[PDB]
Design a protein around this ligand. Structure first.
Ligand SMILES: C[C@H]1Oc2cc(cnc2N)-c2c(nn(C)c2C#N)CN(C)C(=O)c2ccc(F)cc21
Length: 292
Protein backbone atom coordinates (compact mmCIF):
# COMPACT_ATOMS: atom_id res chain seq x y z
CA UNK A 1 0.00 0.00 0.00
CA UNK A 2 1.18 3.53 -0.99
CA UNK A 3 2.86 5.99 1.39
CA UNK A 4 2.30 9.73 1.79
CA UNK A 5 4.63 12.43 3.11
CA UNK A 6 3.32 15.69 4.60
CA UNK A 7 5.28 18.08 6.77
CA UNK A 8 8.03 15.90 8.19
CA UNK A 9 6.04 12.67 8.52
CA UNK A 10 5.47 9.75 6.15
CA UNK A 11 2.15 7.94 6.54
CA UNK A 12 0.46 4.80 5.24
CA UNK A 13 -3.07 3.43 4.85
CA UNK A 14 -2.43 1.50 8.06
CA UNK A 15 -2.37 4.89 9.76
CA UNK A 16 -5.95 5.74 8.78
CA UNK A 17 -8.44 5.40 11.63
CA UNK A 18 -10.61 2.44 10.66
CA UNK A 19 -14.18 2.82 11.89
CA UNK A 20 -16.16 -0.42 12.24
CA UNK A 21 -18.75 -0.62 9.47
CA UNK A 22 -21.40 -1.66 12.00
CA UNK A 23 -21.12 1.71 13.75
CA UNK A 24 -21.93 3.65 10.57
CA UNK A 25 -25.48 4.50 9.47
CA UNK A 26 -26.37 6.19 6.16
CA UNK A 27 -29.15 8.77 6.49
CA UNK A 28 -29.66 10.46 3.12
CA UNK A 29 -28.01 11.39 -0.16
CA UNK A 30 -26.32 14.79 -0.29
CA UNK A 31 -25.69 15.31 -3.99
CA UNK A 32 -23.44 12.39 -4.90
CA UNK A 33 -18.81 8.70 -6.41
CA UNK A 34 -21.74 9.17 -4.04
CA UNK A 35 -21.91 11.20 -0.83
CA UNK A 36 -24.21 10.61 2.14
CA UNK A 37 -25.11 12.16 5.44
CA UNK A 38 -24.16 9.56 8.03
CA UNK A 39 -23.99 8.82 11.75
CA UNK A 40 -21.13 7.11 13.58
CA UNK A 41 -23.76 9.89 17.76
CA UNK A 42 -21.34 11.78 15.51
CA UNK A 43 -22.78 13.35 12.35
CA UNK A 44 -20.58 12.74 9.31
CA UNK A 45 -20.45 13.01 5.55
CA UNK A 46 -19.79 9.65 3.90
CA UNK A 47 -17.74 9.68 0.70
CA UNK A 48 -18.07 6.33 -1.05
CA UNK A 49 -16.02 4.47 -3.63
CA UNK A 50 -18.32 2.75 -6.15
CA UNK A 51 -17.50 -0.96 -6.28
CA UNK A 52 -17.65 -0.74 -10.08
CA UNK A 53 -14.46 1.34 -10.07
CA UNK A 54 -11.06 0.00 -11.13
CA UNK A 55 -7.66 -0.32 -9.43
CA UNK A 56 -6.39 3.23 -9.94
CA UNK A 57 -9.72 4.53 -8.63
CA UNK A 58 -9.24 2.59 -5.39
CA UNK A 59 -5.74 3.99 -4.95
CA UNK A 60 -6.81 7.57 -5.67
CA UNK A 61 -9.71 7.27 -3.21
CA UNK A 62 -7.29 5.92 -0.62
CA UNK A 63 -4.62 8.58 -1.18
CA UNK A 64 -7.23 11.31 -0.72
CA UNK A 65 -8.10 9.94 2.73
CA UNK A 66 -4.41 9.98 3.69
CA UNK A 67 -3.98 13.54 2.46
CA UNK A 68 -6.98 14.98 4.30
CA UNK A 69 -6.19 13.00 7.48
CA UNK A 70 -2.72 14.55 7.77
CA UNK A 71 -3.92 18.17 7.71
CA UNK A 72 -4.66 19.99 10.97
CA UNK A 73 -6.33 23.33 10.28
CA UNK A 74 -9.72 24.90 11.01
CA UNK A 75 -10.36 25.82 7.36
CA UNK A 76 -9.68 22.36 6.01
CA UNK A 77 -12.38 19.71 6.43
CA UNK A 78 -11.62 17.06 9.06
CA UNK A 79 -11.43 13.36 8.28
CA UNK A 80 -13.23 11.43 11.03
CA UNK A 81 -11.84 8.16 9.74
CA UNK A 82 -12.40 5.50 7.11
CA UNK A 83 -14.22 2.21 6.65
CA UNK A 84 -12.02 0.30 4.22
CA UNK A 85 -12.54 -3.28 5.38
CA UNK A 86 -16.05 -3.46 3.94
CA UNK A 87 -17.50 -2.61 0.52
CA UNK A 88 -18.24 -0.06 -0.65
CA UNK A 89 -15.25 1.69 0.94
CA UNK A 90 -16.11 4.77 3.04
CA UNK A 91 -14.28 7.96 3.86
CA UNK A 92 -15.82 9.78 6.82
CA UNK A 93 -15.63 13.57 6.77
CA UNK A 94 -16.67 16.49 8.93
CA UNK A 95 -20.31 17.17 8.06
CA UNK A 96 -20.69 20.59 6.46
CA UNK A 97 -24.40 21.38 6.56
CA UNK A 98 -24.01 24.47 4.41
CA UNK A 99 -22.97 22.37 1.42
CA UNK A 100 -20.55 23.45 -1.30
CA UNK A 101 -19.76 27.13 -1.75
CA UNK A 102 -20.79 27.46 -5.41
CA UNK A 103 -24.28 26.05 -4.81
CA UNK A 104 -24.64 28.15 -1.65
CA UNK A 105 -23.76 31.41 -3.41
CA UNK A 106 -26.20 30.69 -6.23
CA UNK A 107 -29.06 29.59 -3.98
CA UNK A 108 -28.49 32.34 -1.43
CA UNK A 109 -28.29 35.28 -3.85
CA UNK A 110 -30.25 38.27 -2.50
CA UNK A 111 -33.75 38.38 -3.97
CA UNK A 112 -36.90 40.52 -3.72
CA UNK A 113 -38.02 38.04 -1.05
CA UNK A 114 -34.59 37.78 0.61
CA UNK A 115 -32.99 41.19 -0.09
CA UNK A 116 -30.88 40.88 3.05
CA UNK A 117 -29.86 37.22 2.68
CA UNK A 118 -26.17 37.97 2.07
CA UNK A 119 -23.99 41.04 2.57
CA UNK A 120 -20.49 42.04 1.48
CA UNK A 121 -19.00 41.17 4.88
CA UNK A 122 -20.33 37.60 4.56
CA UNK A 123 -18.45 37.22 1.26
CA UNK A 124 -15.28 38.70 2.75
CA UNK A 125 -15.45 36.25 5.64
CA UNK A 126 -15.78 33.30 3.26
CA UNK A 127 -12.78 34.61 1.28
CA UNK A 128 -10.77 35.08 4.47
CA UNK A 129 -11.61 31.55 5.65
CA UNK A 130 -10.40 29.91 2.45
CA UNK A 131 -7.35 32.19 2.27
CA UNK A 132 -6.43 31.06 5.78
CA UNK A 133 -6.72 27.47 4.58
CA UNK A 134 -4.56 28.26 1.55
CA UNK A 135 -1.99 29.97 3.76
CA UNK A 136 -1.70 26.82 5.90
CA UNK A 137 -1.18 24.70 2.78
CA UNK A 138 1.40 27.18 1.44
CA UNK A 139 3.42 27.28 4.65
CA UNK A 140 3.37 23.48 4.61
CA UNK A 141 4.52 23.32 0.97
CA UNK A 142 1.31 21.71 -0.27
CA UNK A 143 -0.05 22.82 -3.64
CA UNK A 144 -3.78 22.32 -4.02
CA UNK A 145 -4.01 22.83 -7.81
CA UNK A 146 -7.81 23.15 -7.87
CA UNK A 147 -8.85 26.05 -5.62
CA UNK A 148 -12.42 26.84 -6.67
CA UNK A 149 -15.87 27.38 -5.17
CA UNK A 150 -17.00 23.85 -6.08
CA UNK A 151 -14.25 22.49 -3.82
CA UNK A 152 -15.13 24.55 -0.73
CA UNK A 153 -17.75 23.71 1.91
CA UNK A 154 -19.68 25.67 4.55
CA UNK A 155 -20.32 24.58 8.15
CA UNK A 156 -23.87 25.96 8.02
CA UNK A 157 -26.23 28.14 5.90
CA UNK A 158 -26.61 30.83 8.55
CA UNK A 159 -24.46 33.79 9.71
CA UNK A 160 -22.02 31.76 11.82
CA UNK A 161 -20.79 29.86 8.78
CA UNK A 162 -17.17 28.82 8.30
CA UNK A 163 -15.79 28.03 4.84
CA UNK A 164 -13.30 25.19 4.45
CA UNK A 165 -11.46 23.48 1.62
CA UNK A 166 -13.23 20.16 1.19
CA UNK A 167 -11.85 18.42 -1.88
CA UNK A 168 -8.25 17.37 -2.58
CA UNK A 169 -8.75 15.14 -5.61
CA UNK A 170 -6.53 17.07 -8.03
CA UNK A 171 -3.53 17.19 -5.69
CA UNK A 172 -4.19 13.47 -5.22
CA UNK A 173 -4.13 12.71 -8.95
CA UNK A 174 -0.85 14.56 -9.52
CA UNK A 175 0.46 12.72 -6.46
CA UNK A 176 -0.77 9.38 -7.84
CA UNK A 177 -7.32 12.16 -16.96
CA UNK A 178 -8.50 14.47 -19.71
CA UNK A 179 -7.81 17.87 -21.24
CA UNK A 180 -11.48 18.87 -21.45
CA UNK A 181 -11.65 18.15 -17.71
CA UNK A 182 -8.72 20.33 -16.64
CA UNK A 183 -9.91 23.38 -14.68
CA UNK A 184 -8.20 25.72 -17.14
CA UNK A 185 -10.39 28.66 -16.07
CA UNK A 186 -8.74 28.52 -12.64
CA UNK A 187 -5.17 28.06 -13.93
CA UNK A 188 -2.32 30.56 -14.52
CA UNK A 189 -0.39 30.56 -17.84
CA UNK A 190 2.71 28.72 -16.63
CA UNK A 191 0.44 25.98 -15.27
CA UNK A 192 -1.62 25.26 -18.38
CA UNK A 193 1.27 25.96 -20.77
CA UNK A 194 4.27 24.43 -18.97
CA UNK A 195 2.66 22.21 -16.36
CA UNK A 196 4.54 24.24 -13.77
CA UNK A 197 2.84 24.36 -10.38
CA UNK A 198 3.98 26.36 -7.34
CA UNK A 199 2.36 28.08 -4.36
CA UNK A 200 1.76 30.91 -6.82
CA UNK A 201 -0.44 28.54 -8.81
CA UNK A 202 -2.88 28.55 -5.90
CA UNK A 203 -2.68 32.35 -5.68
CA UNK A 204 -3.97 32.70 -9.25
CA UNK A 205 -6.73 30.18 -8.62
CA UNK A 206 -7.71 31.99 -5.44
CA UNK A 207 -8.13 35.14 -7.49
CA UNK A 208 -10.65 33.29 -9.63
CA UNK A 209 -12.39 31.95 -6.50
CA UNK A 210 -12.65 35.56 -5.30
CA UNK A 211 -14.42 36.41 -8.56
CA UNK A 212 -16.73 33.42 -8.09
CA UNK A 213 -17.56 34.62 -4.58
CA UNK A 214 -18.22 38.25 -5.39
CA UNK A 215 -20.16 37.38 -8.55
CA UNK A 216 -22.29 35.19 -6.27
CA UNK A 217 -21.55 31.91 -8.00
CA UNK A 218 -21.21 32.71 -11.70
CA UNK A 219 -19.02 30.57 -13.92
CA UNK A 220 -15.71 32.40 -14.57
CA UNK A 221 -15.18 34.00 -18.00
CA UNK A 222 -18.90 34.04 -18.86
CA UNK A 223 -19.59 32.75 -22.37
CA UNK A 224 -15.97 31.78 -23.06
CA UNK A 225 -14.95 28.18 -23.67
CA UNK A 226 -11.83 26.66 -22.12
CA UNK A 227 -9.75 27.16 -25.27
CA UNK A 228 -10.95 30.75 -25.60
CA UNK A 229 -10.01 31.46 -21.98
CA UNK A 230 -6.59 29.93 -22.61
CA UNK A 231 -5.94 32.31 -25.52
CA UNK A 232 -7.56 35.23 -23.66
CA UNK A 233 -5.45 34.85 -20.50
CA UNK A 234 -2.25 34.14 -22.43
CA UNK A 235 -2.75 37.41 -24.31
CA UNK A 236 -3.15 39.45 -21.12
CA UNK A 237 -6.94 39.29 -20.91
CA UNK A 238 -8.53 39.32 -17.44
CA UNK A 239 -12.11 39.22 -16.11
CA UNK A 240 -13.97 42.46 -15.40
CA UNK A 241 -15.15 43.16 -11.82
CA UNK A 242 -18.21 41.21 -10.71
CA UNK A 243 -21.33 43.37 -10.57
CA UNK A 244 -21.13 45.89 -7.69
CA UNK A 245 -17.70 44.60 -6.66
CA UNK A 246 -15.73 47.11 -4.54
CA UNK A 247 -12.50 48.32 -6.11
CA UNK A 248 -10.35 47.14 -3.18
CA UNK A 249 -11.67 43.60 -3.69
CA UNK A 250 -11.20 43.65 -7.48
CA UNK A 251 -7.65 44.87 -6.83
CA UNK A 252 -6.87 41.70 -4.91
CA UNK A 253 -8.14 39.65 -7.85
CA UNK A 254 -6.01 41.52 -10.38
CA UNK A 255 -2.93 41.09 -8.18
CA UNK A 256 -3.55 37.33 -7.96
CA UNK A 257 -3.72 37.33 -11.78
CA UNK A 258 -0.34 38.93 -12.48
CA UNK A 259 1.29 37.19 -15.44
CA UNK A 260 4.58 36.46 -13.66
CA UNK A 261 4.19 34.22 -10.59
CA UNK A 262 6.80 36.26 -8.71
CA UNK A 263 4.60 39.36 -9.08
CA UNK A 264 1.61 37.70 -7.39
CA UNK A 265 1.05 37.97 -3.60
CA UNK A 266 1.55 35.05 -1.22
CA UNK A 267 -1.39 34.19 1.02
CA UNK A 268 -0.09 36.13 4.00
CA UNK A 269 -0.35 39.28 1.88
CA UNK A 270 -3.71 38.23 0.48
CA UNK A 271 -5.02 37.79 4.04
CA UNK A 272 -3.75 41.25 4.99
CA UNK A 273 -5.54 42.83 2.03
CA UNK A 274 -8.77 40.95 2.72
CA UNK A 275 -8.60 42.12 6.33
CA UNK A 276 -8.17 45.73 5.22
CA UNK A 277 -11.25 45.34 3.01
CA UNK A 278 -13.32 44.17 5.99
CA UNK A 279 -12.23 47.31 7.86
CA UNK A 280 -13.31 49.70 5.13
CA UNK A 281 -16.91 50.90 5.66
CA UNK A 282 -17.19 51.83 2.00
CA UNK A 283 -16.43 48.23 1.03
CA UNK A 284 -18.70 46.40 3.45
CA UNK A 285 -21.57 48.88 3.17
CA UNK A 286 -21.70 48.23 -0.58
CA UNK A 287 -25.01 46.66 -1.59
CA UNK A 288 -24.99 43.35 -3.43
CA UNK A 289 -27.02 43.12 -6.66
CA UNK A 290 -30.54 41.77 -6.19
CA UNK A 291 -31.50 39.60 -9.15
CA UNK A 292 -35.14 39.94 -10.21
C1 LIG B 1 -16.97 15.00 -0.23
C2 LIG B 1 -18.10 16.03 -0.04
O1 LIG B 1 -18.13 16.33 1.41
C3 LIG B 1 -19.20 17.00 2.01
C4 LIG B 1 -20.36 17.46 1.34
C5 LIG B 1 -21.43 18.14 1.97
C6 LIG B 1 -21.25 18.34 3.35
N1 LIG B 1 -20.14 17.91 4.06
C7 LIG B 1 -19.13 17.25 3.40
N2 LIG B 1 -18.00 16.84 4.14
C8 LIG B 1 -22.60 18.60 1.15
C9 LIG B 1 -22.68 18.91 -0.28
N3 LIG B 1 -23.90 19.29 -0.65
N4 LIG B 1 -24.63 19.25 0.47
C10 LIG B 1 -26.03 19.62 0.39
C11 LIG B 1 -23.92 18.85 1.59
C12 LIG B 1 -24.52 18.74 2.89
N5 LIG B 1 -25.00 18.68 3.94
C13 LIG B 1 -21.62 18.87 -1.38
N6 LIG B 1 -21.35 17.53 -2.01
C14 LIG B 1 -22.52 16.71 -2.38
C15 LIG B 1 -20.05 16.97 -2.30
O2 LIG B 1 -19.87 15.87 -2.82
C16 LIG B 1 -18.79 17.72 -1.97
C17 LIG B 1 -18.52 18.90 -2.74
C18 LIG B 1 -17.36 19.67 -2.50
C19 LIG B 1 -16.47 19.27 -1.49
F1 LIG B 1 -15.37 20.01 -1.27
C20 LIG B 1 -16.70 18.11 -0.71
C21 LIG B 1 -17.87 17.29 -0.92
Amino acid sequence: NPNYCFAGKTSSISDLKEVPRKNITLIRGLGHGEVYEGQVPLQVAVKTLPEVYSEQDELDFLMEALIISKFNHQNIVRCIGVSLQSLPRFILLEFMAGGDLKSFLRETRPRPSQPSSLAMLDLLHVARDIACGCQYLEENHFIHRDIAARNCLLTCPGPGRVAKIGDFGMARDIYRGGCAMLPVKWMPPEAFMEGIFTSKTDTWSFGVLLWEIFSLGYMPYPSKSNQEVLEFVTSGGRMDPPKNCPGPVYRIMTQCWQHQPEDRPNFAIILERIEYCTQDPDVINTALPIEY
